[PDB]
Structure formats: C-alpha cells, structure tokens
Specification:
Chain C: This is Splicing factor 3A subunit 3. This is part of a larger assembly, with 8 protein chains of 8 kinds. Chain B is α+β, with helices and mostly antiparallel strands and about 180 residues long. Chain B has helices at about 20-30, 65-75, 115-125, 155-165; strands spanning about 10, 55-60, 80, 85-90, 95-100, 130-135, 145-150, 165-170, 170, 175. The radius of gyration of chain B is 28 Å and the shape is elongated. Chain B starts with 7 loop residues before the first strand and ends with a strand. Chain C has about 50 residues and is α+β, with helices and mostly antiparallel strands. A two-stranded antiparallel sheet of chain C has the order 1-2. In chain C, a hairpin with a 5-residue loop joins β1 and β2 (about 25). Chain G has a two-stranded antiparallel ribbon. Helix content of chain G is about 20%, strand content about 0%. With about 170 residues, chain G is an all-alpha fold. The chains are: A alpha+beta (about 160), B alpha+beta (about 180), C alpha+beta (about 50), D little secondary structure (about 90), E mainly beta (about 220), F mainly alpha (about 70), G mainly alpha (about 170), H mainly alpha (about 290). Chains in contact: A-G, B-H, C-G, D-E, D-H, E-F, E-H, F-G, F-H, G-H. Chains G and H meet through α2 and α3 of G and α7, α9 and α11 of H. The structure holds one RNA strand of 60 nucleotides.
Chain lengths: ~160, ~180, ~50, ~90, ~220, ~70, ~170, ~290
Amino acid sequence: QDATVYVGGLDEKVSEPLLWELFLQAGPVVNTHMPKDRVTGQHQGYGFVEFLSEEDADYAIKIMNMIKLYGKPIRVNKANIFIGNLDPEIDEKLLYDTFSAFGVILQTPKIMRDPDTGNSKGYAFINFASFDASDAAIEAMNGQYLCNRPITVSYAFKKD
Amino acid sequence: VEEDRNTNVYVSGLPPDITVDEFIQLMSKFGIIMRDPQTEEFKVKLYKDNQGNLKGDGLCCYLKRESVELALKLLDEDEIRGYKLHVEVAKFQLRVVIIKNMFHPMDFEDDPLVLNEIREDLRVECSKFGQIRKLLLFDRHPDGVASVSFRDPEEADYCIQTLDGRWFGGRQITAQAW
Amino acid sequence: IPYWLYKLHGLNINYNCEICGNYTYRGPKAFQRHFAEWRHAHGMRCLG
Amino acid sequence: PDLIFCRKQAGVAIGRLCEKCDGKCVICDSYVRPCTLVRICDECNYGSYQGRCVICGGPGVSDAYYCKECTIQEKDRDGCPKIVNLGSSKTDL
Amino acid sequence: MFLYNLTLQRATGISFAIHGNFSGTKQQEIVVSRGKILELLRPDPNTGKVHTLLTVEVFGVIRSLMAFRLTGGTKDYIVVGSDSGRIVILEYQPSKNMFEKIHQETFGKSGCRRIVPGQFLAVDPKGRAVMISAIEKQKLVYILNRDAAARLTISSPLEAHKANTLVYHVVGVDVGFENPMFACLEMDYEEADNDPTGEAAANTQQTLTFYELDLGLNHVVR
Amino acid sequence: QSKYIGTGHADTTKWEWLVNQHRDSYCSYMGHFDLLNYFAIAENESKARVRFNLMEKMLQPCGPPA
Amino acid sequence: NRFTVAELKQLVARPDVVEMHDVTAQDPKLLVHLKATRNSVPVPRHWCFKRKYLQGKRGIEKPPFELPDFIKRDIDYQKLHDAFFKWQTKPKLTIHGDLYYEGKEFEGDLSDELRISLGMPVGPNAHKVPPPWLIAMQRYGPPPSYPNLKIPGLNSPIPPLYGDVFGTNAAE
Amino acid sequence: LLPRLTPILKNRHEKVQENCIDLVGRIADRGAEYVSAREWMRICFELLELLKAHKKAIRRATVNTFGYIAKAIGPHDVLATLLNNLKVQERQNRVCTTVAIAIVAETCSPFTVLPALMNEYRVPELNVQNGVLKSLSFLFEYIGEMGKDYIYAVTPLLEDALMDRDLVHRQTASAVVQHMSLGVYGFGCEDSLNHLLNYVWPNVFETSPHVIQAVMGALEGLRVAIGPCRMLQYCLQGLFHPARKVRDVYWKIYNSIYIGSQDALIAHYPRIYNDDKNTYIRYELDYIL
RNA sequence: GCCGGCUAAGAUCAAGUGUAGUAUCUGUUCUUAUCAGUUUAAUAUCUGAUUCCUCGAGGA
C-alpha cells in the first residue's frame, strides 16, 4: 500500500497499460490494477499503480496531482450537507478551507472512500454551523466551478 | 417470417416415367437422407401419385441448407434420361453359438412332435438375444448338438452367457462359442 | 453432505503444517496449497 | 482390431496382395505413396502359400509394398510383414 | 543461414582392407573401407606404388569387409554391412570404373546395436552361406549359389541366433568339401548376470562354438 | 530372444537399465569409427587392444552383482 | 520401508524440484537424479488429477480458432501468394517444454489518443509547450527514480520535441 | 464427345470405367476448356465416389483425371464444392471426398485449399471441425514435401483442435501432426513441430484403447522425424515415476523411441552419477583428445 | 455454470438396446462409523474384528 499509488479521476480513454505508460516517466511502475464494476463491467475511475520503490510513488503523487488526463481530474495519492461529483485531488483540510469562505465549519469534514481502494468514492458529507451557511452553500457552492469537476451540494435530510 | 435458409427444393421438368428410387439417388448426390417418419417426400401427382404419373414437380429435403444451396447452384437443369430439369427454392408451388446337452435322440423316437417343439423353443430363446440368421438342431447327435448363427457375435456371446448353466427339459445344457 | 464426493475429492484428511503456525489443513489438494499461502508464508517469515 | 504379423526372418521372397488389398501397405495400411516392396519369410511361400496376398490372404495380383510414412520410420526392417494372428493363423476358414 | 557441405579432401584412414582378384583376372586388388568412403587399390608392380582406382562415398558404416570369389570365379563379390541391416554384395565392373550392387538384401533395422546384425562378416572360402552377425545373439546365414549364368543367387537367411550370448569374433573355417564349419568366440553373459554373490566374473570365459550350416538341415546348427 | 531385448518395462530396476545402457553403448564403440579412433588416442592403444577391452567389459559392466 | 520425504529430500543435492508423491517410488534417488536433468521437461500436471483436464472447466468461453492475418490479410493471383507466402506473420508460441496444463491459457512518451483526450496541443517548432506534469518537475527537481530521463525546457533544448515524443532516455 | 462420354463413366464395367476415366482426363489434357463449368462439376461429383474402388487402376485413374479437372475448373469452385460435399455422403464413402480435397492440394498451390479450408473451422459444429481435421490429415499425408513451405500458418489451427475439446477431435490433430512430420522430415521446420509436440505430449494420458494409437503413432513419427535428443529429453523425467500406471506409458514410449534410433540415442542420455555400489557413470566418453 | 455455496465434481450393482469395435439409457446404494492385513504414487477397494434419554413406542 505504501509503494502503490491510488489514482482517481480516470475517464473512458484511460486504460490499464495507459496509466502504466504515463507513470513510467515518474518511476518504475511494476503493475497496474483497475477494478471493474458489476453492472457496467468497466472501470469506475479509480485505479492503482504498484511501483517498485516508495520514492517513485511519492514522486508520482507529487507530480501527477490534479492533472487533466483524458478530460478528467486525475490525481495520485498514497494508498447536514452532501457534496457529489467532487475531485479526488482535494483533501479534508482543502475541503475545510474551501468551505470556510462561505460559512463557518463545525468540525473537520469527512469524505467517503471505497472499501477496496480507499482513496475516494465520489461523495462527501460536511456539516455547517447554522442553516445560513447551508443555504449559502446550496445557493453558491451548489454549482460552482471546482478543479475540473462540477460539484453538486444538496441537503442530506429535510423535513416538509 | 423466415425468408432464407430454406430446406425445400422444387425440381421441375421431370419425365412421368420416373420412379422414386431415381429421385432418392438424385437427392443423395447433394444430401444423405430425409427419412424422418419413414422416408422422404416425392412428387405429388393428381390422385396422390396413384393414378397420374407426376404433376411436373417434385419435392426434395436435406439435413442442412448449405447442401440444398449447393445442389440448386450445381444441379440446375440436370439432364435425366427423359429430359433436362430445373431446380428452385419455392417457385410458388408447395458369431455362432453351440449348445450341447439340450435333447436326446431317444426322446424323438416315440415323440415326432417333441423335436419341432424343442426347435421352436430354441428359436424363441435365440430370438430374444438378437437376430438369428440360421438355427440348426442335430437330431442324430448323442450329445444334443445345436448351432445358432446370428448376424452379430455380441448377440451370440450374450446368448452363450445366458444359456450356460440353464436348465432345459430337466437337463443342464451348456453353451460355447464357435 | 456429499460423503462419496468427500471420499473422492480427498476429504476426511488433514496435514499438520508446523512451520505455518502448526495449522491443520485439508487433504492432498490443500496439502500442497498449504505450502503456498498467506499463513504459511507469514509463519516462514517469522521463523527466519 | 489389433492385427498381428509373422515377423520372422525376411527371406528373399517378394510380397503380393489381392485385387482389393493391393494398394495399401501390409503394415501402414495406406494407399499414399508406396516406397519399397514388402517381403515374406520361408513359411510364407511354401506349397499352398505360393502367390498369396499379404492383407487379403488369398490370391495375389500385385507386389506388396510399404507406405512412404512406414518405410521412412524403419518399419519395413521388421520380420515377415504377413498379416497372421491367432484368428488369421494357418488353420483358418 | 543455409550451409552446403564439400569434401575438399577425402578421408585417409584405412580401417579395413581385403585382397583378391576383384577385376576378374589374376591382378590383385585391395579394397580399403576408410569409413564413409570405400576405395579400391591396385599394387602396380611396374611402378611399385599402389594406385587407388575408385573412392566411392558410401554414406554408411562398413562394420566389416570379407571378399569371396565363388567356386571357379574370375572376380570376387565384396560383402559390406552398414549402420542398417542392408547387406550389400557388390562386384567391381571395370567397364567405366564404377561399382555395382549385385544384391542389396534387408536384414534388420538401422543402428549398430547389439541385437541388430551387420557387425561381423564371416565368409566360407571352401563353400558358401556367408554369416553376417551382430555382437549380441544376432547372426544370419546367407546361402550363395550359382545360377545357369553363374549368377550370385542369395538364399533365404538361416538365422541361428543364440540366447544372450555375446560374440567376440566369427570366422568360417575351410572344411573338406563338407558342411561349412563356422567358428565364433561366444560367451554366455546371461548365466553370469543372475547371481547376488559376485563370483560370476570368474569361471566364465570365452568359448569356441562351431556351427555346421549344412544344406541338408537347411539351418546353421552347432 | 529378439522380442524386446535392449529395454526393460514398467518396473525395470535402475541397475538393469544402466546395464543395457552400457551394453548397447559399447556396440556403438566397437562398431563406430569416430568413437573408436578417438578412444585409441586418449588411452594410447591400438584398435585391437581397445576393442578387446570393450568386448571383455561387456561381461557385466557398470558394477555387477555377479 | 522407504526414505522419508525429508531424508529423501536432503540426501539429494537438488531438492528444489522435489515432489512429495515422488518419494514413494521404487527408486527415489534414481527419480531425483533423472529429474535433475539440464533442460528436460517433467511429467504434465495431469499425473494425479482425475478430472482429465477437461471436465472441470468444461464451459469454454472463447472463439474456436481466430483466422490468422498471415494468410487472410479465381481466388487470387497477384495477392494470394503475395499475402500468405509474402506478408506472413511468424507464430510466436512456447519454445521447448511448455507442456499443456489443464487450462494453460486462462492463467517520456505519450500516445496520440491520450494527448488528444487530455487537451494537450501538438509540439510547436521553436517554443515552450510543456505537459502539466513538467511544471512540478521544473519546480521540485528531476525525479530520482529515472535520472537519465530528459525533458524539453529543463535538460533537452526546445528546437528535443517532435510529434508526440515529449521525452527521451539518454543512458550513460 | 463430352456429353456422350459423360454417361459412359457411370457404367459399372471395370475396364470400361478405367478407360473412360483416362479418356475424360486426357480430354482436358492439352486445351482442357471444351466444357461448361457445370458439366465438369457434375463429372467430378460423379467420379468422387469411384476414388476408392476395389481395382487400384480405377483409383489411380480417378486421381490422375481429377487433378486436371480441378486445374481446368478452378480452385475456389472445386474447393467450395468439396467443402459442401463434406456434410452429405455420410461416413461410408465420405473420406474419399476429403481425398479429393487433397487432390486439389496436389492439383493446385497450397494456398488454394489452406485459406479456404481455414474458414471452415470457424463454424462451432463438432462434426464439421472434426471433418476439417480428418481432411487436413490426408492433406498433409499426401501433400508430400510441400508442407515445409507453409507449416507455421497451419500450426495454430491444429493446436486449437488438439486442445481438451473432445475425444474424437484428438486423434485427428495427432494424425495431422504425424503425417506432417514425416512429410517435413529434415526440411527445416522443427520449430512448428516442437510447438505442436508441446500440446501432443500431454494427450498421452488417455485410457481410450482406440485413442492411444492416434497418439502412439504421432510419437513414433516424431521420434523418427525429430531425433531422440529431444523426445527422450521429454520422456526422461518419468522413466521411474512412482505411479504404476504412469510408467506403463512412459516405458512404452521409451520402447517405441528405442527400437527406432537404437544407437542414435546413445549420445543423448544424461550422466547417471556413480553410486557406491557400482560404476554407473560412463567415464569412457569424457575424454579430452 | 451463478452470485465459499447451492450435492450436475467421482466410484459402483441390476436390467434394456446395439456394434466388427467403442458404447447408449433407466433404476439404486455411497461407507456419514473405528481398528488389523492386501493394495494404491497417495486415495480407493477388498479381506476380518469391534445401557441411557424422551413420550408400549422412538432415538442414541
């Protein structure tokens, strides 16, 4: 897990030897793994590249971070408001700093991860201090231009 | 619904002096057999092919469609003894077992019908094991020799296995191969 | 359930892998499998 | 259907075959490219055995040869290639 | 890469030789089996040096040579064995300086094994029926006869193979117009290889065994 | 006699296999020319000497339990 | 009545190819010696398996025989022998001893399509058009995993870059 | 004369049919066109049943005439006709039709029947690929020394059929291999022979009494067309295998490879090391002179 | 074959059909158990021995 780098944000043009060919300049990528879905039978955008040394994986994570690969925000990492279609290049501290401009955050946010890879699932949950920050996130942040990924902010629970 | 992949071939221009064996021989040139119920179809005459000779048409079927296509592409206007004929798809028309110790010559001296009944019983016993082609019984042999010749040696081996050690007429008869 | 299948495939038999944590494997099918596995590999690495 | 052979000392007698069993080799049993001529032992041409087919065991109409796939394999260098077994022995129908 | 072979110089090893009036006249002739190549040499007395007439690349292995001129014959028929059992009795033809296989008979398979004949060639000068034998219990007897035109008719092989008996050497002794006696240094290696102790090496030496291949018996009998 | 002499069968002992190996490997030595003119150069003996040695070795070579 | 699996595996000088079932033969040392051949080929995997190597995976899911392009890519006069006997591809299969098992078949440069999908323009004549991963290499330094790699702008000159080649490995 | 001689060939007379076959053949000898394609196709379909007659003279004349007939008619048409004829004429005289295909291989270049017959294997039918293999058997058995020119393009077609497919699709591949090895004997095609042998070896373990001979003959052909230096190299690993039913086949294959190349395999065995109870190493061959 | 399992992974008895030969189909049982010998590469196979609880009954 230390020598392997988890890549997120892969489109349909990216393939299993294509990621190994793109990561060959960063370091000696020994193997590439792409988990296939059960309903569609294709990649879900997240994969793994197992290299030989941990320094090559660190250089690939520091070089290929927030890159625009196949029209997709590909990024390598070390393997009541709901935000969907978020970029995997952002972290919890980066999401807390991005959410601090609209309103005040009550605590540190959390992002959902896949049970197989564990880098990024695609959705996240963040809680605001009051309902005014949630309304400002649903008015402004729900549709704002993020890092090559259109996010969507919505209410997790609402009572009619 | 189905348009292509037809197995029905219509042969036209056949002389009325043709028979069914010739049609079967001609169909065998491009196929094997179409005798599903009993045999394959033939030409349909006026009185069900009983009074008339033939209504200038004959039907032929094959196991596969490629064979029928090849026949139609090759047997087109084939010349038979009476004339040339055309082919179309639809055309808008339609091993010896020896048994011993079975009988005695002394029993046939005062009973002329016992030998024929014993031969009929031996034939009925040999018919259950296979097709008996020849069956003979030596009435003048003191050991009671009988020969059963069948078309297959497996049926003769089964009859020799089922007849060895069995009792017939109160005496233990033996069976062997030939 | 399939006792005949158990006697045919090689059930009702085990193998004592002492180096693999003294584990108790199945029959000959698992016998060789017990030499190439995660538990046996960890036991061999811990043995030195 | 495993046919047996004599396989004795190959004498100076040439082979033969029947009108129907003349093409195929006495051992290879193939009609493809006959290479060499077959032979027989001393007990294969003696009185009644004069001029007999090596496969049909009856009248001879030609000379018994070997297949090119059977002569290149050194199969012809064996004993008498006469097709004789327990069933196809001297005392046969 | 496709290579092509060329014999820039033939072999020069006289592994065998046999003397006889091979051309037919009283002129002597010595045949040398140099391995792959077989040569014939005439010892020209007018010059002293021996002139090698023919060097035929035989494409085989001549395990033995033993010439034989028949009873009342001008030339002599050289008998040759090869890697296979194809025994060749050939006579020299001075018409164009070329040999001629007078008779090519099949004996066994190829390869100079212990049970495949073709190793030793023992001729009977005072008679006929040359022996052609292997090392391990393989020996055929080819009876040679003369036709109406003095043809070298080879008879059927009268095999007298022993049972697990190794052959040291075989030569046919000249009998007094009787059945040709053929002696061989045979040794029974079967009775020795079937004991646990180890004393089988001793008390089991070679033995001269002489067989008489009389035409009446029609077989080589000891 | 000459049925299958030269090789054993399903339960042939290793010694009985090596015995046939040597017994059929010397016949390719007493008969073949390159492998006979090559051994008489190493041992530095004549053809008859080496041939008689190989013939006498055919009694029970490879190490005989005799 | 025979050597154990350890005694018959330690007495031999090459236990790396030792087999558990081989130690119960009539001559274990002889079999171990014969198995120690230079480059021989051992018995197949179907020695003890009772499935015949065909009953287990009986559900084959693959084409029967894909038409090779060595012959497929009057029938033809100037192209039949000129495509099968001229434009023929050599079949690259196993070399010496790949004995068929039960299954035996189931077990600086970027492409133009990936560069077109990623939104990267083509290489100009004399300018600086780096990939977006090259800015991190120009800022932090060269990668220690591949020190012999050359990039245009940092180690390679701008007039190099030709087509889709945005890097070259120069081994010393 | 062609339509007049056409019904004459249908006669059952021995000498009459034997002369008519040669007449029809020589009719297409010099000019050879002199016919409609349908007439030649019908004549070929009629003569295809006489390719296995009792008299060998008729069998030779049929093959002598069908070659010129196919050379005059055309490769593609005759090949398609023979392929379509494979399913009809059930297996009492079907194999002769396959021989006719071989006649095309003997009448035309190897690429006249190879690429056309290759597409006949893509069909998933069992007794379609089986017939294709049975035809390739006689093709490589009668093609002669022409298999060396094109043997690597037919290797995968035989390998896919040699796989664990069925019990009747195994004898065909082994027969094709044995009849192609003898035909490419020493011509420089040992690579594809090794490729095919890699698959043909694992099929040795077969309990079918009628399916072992198809592999036994293949091994007996490969021993004499490959050299024991590699066949014995394969067959050495199990010469003393513990299984009583595993040595029963290994010793049989060794016997089959021993009588053939008896002294040829002498310089092929390994160095059996010397035990303390005897002298196993053959030290008489390790000289340096 | 489907998402480790659902007893279509094996051996074996009786009968029918049929071939020159291979074979094809129906109905069982499968030791659920232990020891000794035979045997198998190892299995397998074969050869022999081996009072209580519950509601007259059942199970061990």
